[PDB]
Design a protein around this nucleic acid. Structure first.
Ligand SMILES: [K+]
Ligand SMILES: [Mg+2]
Ligand SMILES: [Mg+2]
Ligand SMILES: [Mg+2]
Ligand SMILES: [Mg+2]
Ligand SMILES: [Mg+2]
Ligand SMILES: [Mg+2]
Ligand SMILES: [Mg+2]
Ligand SMILES: [Mg+2]
Ligand SMILES: [Mg+2]
Ligand SMILES: [Mg+2]
Ligand SMILES: [Mg+2]
Ligand SMILES: [Mg+2]
Ligand SMILES: [Mg+2]
Ligand SMILES: [Mg+2]
Ligand SMILES: [Mg+2]
Ligand SMILES: [Mg+2]
Lengths: 7, 66, 88, 103, 271, 70, 129
RNA sequence: CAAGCUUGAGUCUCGUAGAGGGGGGUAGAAUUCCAGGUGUAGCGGUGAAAUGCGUAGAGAUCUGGAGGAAUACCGGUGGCGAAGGCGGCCCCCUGGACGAAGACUGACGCUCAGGUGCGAAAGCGUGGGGAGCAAACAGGAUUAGAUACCCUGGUAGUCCACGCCGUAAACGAUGUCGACUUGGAGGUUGUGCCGGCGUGGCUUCCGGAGCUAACGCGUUAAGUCGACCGCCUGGGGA
RNA sequence: AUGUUGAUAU
């Protein structure tokens, strides 16, 4: 998830 | 090592011959490996059968603790 | 297996000689003796499947020797199956 | 007729029957066109472990040449005889007259 | 021989017969036959005291020899017979003095076999000895409870008792129930199982087959009105009671053995 | 294993002789073996693997004896 | 079972050549000997000889030239599973005529050269090159 | 088509090794349970715990008893079997393999679609049995969660009889039969000649030519050939 | 003991 990454 | 049964030219190991059979068991009563005693495979099989027959007739013990 | 005596009796009965062990009649007769003997064994030992593979080899071998004998000599075949008491 | 090596060992209380049992068992063999090739009363030995809460028993060897039916009868005799605490009947390839390592 | 019937009608579809071709096809031995007319489960007050008994086939009683007291004298099995009065088959035996008797047929017994009773008898199926003379571990049937009384235990098709131990005057038995039970060692027993062990594999297949055996219908308690049975009553299928007999005793678990007289002879209850 | 402590023997020596006897009979190894069930396939695989180790040792052991390292 | 003794002879030669064997010995037969002649006459093998009466044994002596074996290839063509017969016009030239096809014609076993000359076709036994 | 022949195939004689198979019996070690003695506060379990067991006396220790299941050591890249598989000891019935001497039959052979049989484990049916183990299940943990791994229990099942199922990474991922083609070191089982020198069978490891995409295979071929069968034709969908 | 994950194209 997170509504779509790596930071 | 070396095999005593080939040397003597024996036919059967014989379950009755306890004096012989006692040389091929441990203090615990266990059958000794052929790799230790240097017995030929053919005689090792006969020897196992002999020991197992002797253990049944209670001429040898199964174990050190009965 | 068939005993030395019982074997020899069949060799004499079916052979042209006492030493004629090879003949198709002797071979077929010997197989028939052992096939018939084993019927008692397999009646008792229905799940002796390993032994039965040996029985079915005898049955097969006998079929091959009879099919040989038949085309080689029809009369010798007809005599043999009569004596041994085979359908074919 | 097949060759059998028969060991049986007896309750040490019934040691005095062992002569009688031997002659009875040999009669069963020899009264069927049988033979006794060897017969060795080993006597009372120390058991390697306790059988039947006993520390000794009276052993008897006898090699034999009997039919199967009497040896089967002999086994049932050993079975239903509270004297005979243990028995072993082995087939041998040939007759054995040579004396055992026990004697 | 267990044989499934073919479904040529709905009443036959589920029938499984146990067909023994060894059994005598003829009539039974008349000197050992008696009338036993039926009860309907009614006692001498004329009242039903056991429910669900009535009708079924007329049956003559065969005098079976449970005592087996004719000791010493050998007997040969003439023929096995069907007995209507019991689950086991019976064997008409002929004693060498020319007396005939019926016995319970052990497993493996056939016409021509020799049997004998007594202290000195051989340990083979069919032979009857005092249990002191029988080896510990033996499988036996038709076991006496008191010496001379006659066999009472292990009489049904396929049943037997193991002699598990012998301690002085008493032998311990493992009964079919699983109960371990002391009995006097002077009590006789016959060697081997009772025959006809296929008996339990039969499937009656229809209502009428139970009626032939003289069993009348069981009506469920819950089918009745409250006046008739504790379970009676309800608008619809109702219950809401602990299950009980028609006389109000709990019928799922509650023990009913009460016999301090015989408690001593029970080593272990069946449990 | 069953040691009689003989007359005029230190305990420490007799204890060492007991350890010997147990290691000889292979009691601890037997116990550890039987602690859990080994599937026959697992038993067979380890027997195979042990044999292959001892063999692949023996052949490659001789190779090390021949060749110089320096 | 053994079901092509010719293929077996060719294979004994092929293998024997590869193994730098001096001679190769098979069980004999008329047809094997007939082929051995054609291989001798065309100079692929050196010599052969049959020996025995009840069980005759053919024995081909193999050739090597400048180290190398002389029989470069030797292929069964007609075989029990598939028989090849050719008419005179359709006889095979092995290695553009530098090698032979051994042909069983009505007038005996011979090369495809000899069969062309004799105006015969027949069963194509093998190629040799 | 006819007649042969003995070299393929088979029969006979004597012997050899074998957890080959079927049936029956029996032995010892251990677990569990039951009963009793001694004894007293823990036991058990784990990474750490807890559930669990225990003063109603457990655990430990000793004696006696019951019952089931499996056979330590021997035991071995040992053996046997068509494959699946087969392991205490004894007997009964029984199959195959191998070797040595001949004698015998005379191509009787190889392969095999369809067919038939056998076929681990799990599973199913009927009836038994049930110690130990253990799907399911329950509880205790762990964790964000933990329908898991770990722990305490535990039912089917695992065992027996008979019947069914017909599948497995049922594997050497390598069809069967036959021939041919440098070596080395073993294992196992016969045998001949006199510890050595041969000669058969089966088998483990290495490796040469050759082969192979390579890895590797390598006289037990994946080399060189023949016979017959089975099977493959992009991945998925399947 | 346990101990997850890393948007699309390039
Ligand atoms: K997520
Ligand atoms: Mg044979
Ligand atoms: Mg009723
Ligand atoms: Mg009812
Ligand atoms: Mg109503
Ligand atoms: Mg009421
Ligand atoms: Mg309602
Ligand atoms: Mg309600
Ligand atoms: Mg097919
Ligand atoms: Mg299963
Ligand atoms: Mg089941
Ligand atoms: Mg069941
Ligand atoms: Mg668990
Ligand atoms: Mg498949
Ligand atoms: Mg495969
Ligand atoms: Mg290699
Ligand atoms: Mg990640």
């Amino acid at each position: 998830x997170x509504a779509x990454x790596a930071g | 090592k070396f095999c005593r049964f080939t040397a003597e030219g024996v036919q059967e190991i014989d379950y009755k011959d306890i004096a012989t059979l006692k040389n091929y068991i441990t203090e615990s009563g266990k059958i000794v490996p052929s790799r230790i005693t240097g017995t030929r495979a053919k005689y090792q099989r006969q020897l196992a059968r002999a020991i197992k027959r002797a253990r049944y007739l209670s001429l040898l013990p199964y174990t050190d603790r009965h | 297996s068939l005993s030395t005596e019982a074997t020899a009796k069949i060799v004499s009965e079916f052979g042209r000689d006492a030493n004629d062990t090879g003949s198709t009649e002797v071979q077929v007769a010997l197989l028939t003796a052992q096939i018939n003997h084993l019927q008692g064994h397999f009646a008792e030992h229905k799940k002796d499947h390993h032994s039965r593979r040996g029985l079915l080899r005898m049955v097969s071998q006998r079929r091959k020797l009879l099919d040989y004998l038949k085309r080689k000599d029809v009369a010798r075949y007809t005599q043999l199956i009569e004596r041994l008491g085979l359908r074919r | 007729m097949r060759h059998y090596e028969i060991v049986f060992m007896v309750h040490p209380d019934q040691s005095e029957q062992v002569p009688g049992m031997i002659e009875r068992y040999t009669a069963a063999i020899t009264g069927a066109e049988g033979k006794i090739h060897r017969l060795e009363d080993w006597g009372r030995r120390q058991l390697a472990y306790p059988i039947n809460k006993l520390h000794k028993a009276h052993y008897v060897l006898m090699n034999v040449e009997a039919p199967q039916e009497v040896i089967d009868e002999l086994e049932t005799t050993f079975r239903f005889n509270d004297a005979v605490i243990r028995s072993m009947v082995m087939r041998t390839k040939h007759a054995v007259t040579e004396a055992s390592p026990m004697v | 021989a267990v044989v499934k019937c073919k479904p040529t009608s709905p009443g036959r579809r589920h029938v499984v017969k146990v067909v023994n071709p060894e059994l005598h096809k003829g009539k039974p031995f008349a000197p050992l036959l008696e009338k036993n007319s039926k009860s309907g489960g009614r006692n001498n007050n004329g009242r039903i005291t056991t429910r669900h008994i009535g009708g079924g086939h007329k049956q003559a009683y065969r005098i079976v020899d449970f005592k087996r007291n004719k000791d010493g004298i050998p007997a040969v099995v003439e023929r096995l017979e069907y007995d209507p009065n019991r689950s086991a088959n019976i064997a008409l035996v002929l004693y060498k003095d020319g007396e005939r008797r019926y016995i319970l047929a052990p497993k493996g017994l056939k016409a021509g076999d020799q049997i004998q009773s007594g202290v000195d008898a051989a340990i083979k199926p069919g032979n009857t000895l005092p249990m002191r003379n029988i080896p510990v571990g033996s499988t036996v049937h038709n076991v006496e409870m008191k010496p001379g009384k006659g066999g009472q235990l292990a009489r049904s098709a396929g049943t037997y008792v193991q002699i598990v131990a012998r301690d002085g005057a008493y032998v311990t038995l493992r009964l079919r129930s699983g109960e371990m039970r002391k009995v006097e060692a002077d009590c006789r027993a016959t060697l081997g199982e009772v025959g006809n062990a296929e008996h339990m594999l039969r499937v009656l297949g229809k209502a009428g087959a139970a009626r032939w055996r003289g069993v009348r219908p069981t009506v469920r308690g819950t089918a009745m009105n409250p006046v008739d049975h504790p379970h009676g009553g309800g608008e619809g299928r109702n219950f809401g009671k602990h299950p009980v007999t028609p006389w109000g005793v709990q019928t799922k678990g509650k023990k009913t053995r009460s016999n301090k007289r015989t408690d001593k002879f029970i080593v272990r209850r069946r449990s | 294993p069953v040691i009689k402590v003989r007359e005029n023997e230190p305990f420490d020596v007799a204890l060492r002789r007991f350890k010997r006897s147990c290691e000889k009979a292979g009691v601890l190894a037997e116990v550890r073996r039987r602690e859990f069930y080994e599937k026959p396939t697992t038993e067979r695989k380890r027997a195979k693997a042990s044999a292959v180790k001892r063999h692949a040792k023996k052949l490659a052991r001789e190779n090390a004896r021949r060749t110089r390292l320096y | 079972s053994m079901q092509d003794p010719i293929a077996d002879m060719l294979t004994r030669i092929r293998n024997g050549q590869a193994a730098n064997k001096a001679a190769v010995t098979m069980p004999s037969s008329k047809l094997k000997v007939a082929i051995a002649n054609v291989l001798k006459e065309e100079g692929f093998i050196e010599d052969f000889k049959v020996e025995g009466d009840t069980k005759p044994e053919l024995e081909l002596t193999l050739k090597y030239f400048q180290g190398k074996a002389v029989v470069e290839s030797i292929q069964r063509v007609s075989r029990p599973g598939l028989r090849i017969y050719k008419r005179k016009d359709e006889l095979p030239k092995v290695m553009a005529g530098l090698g032979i096809a051994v042909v069983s014609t009505s007038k005996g076993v011979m090369t495809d050269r000899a069969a062309r000359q004799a105006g015969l076709g027949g069963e194509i036994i093998c190629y040799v090159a």
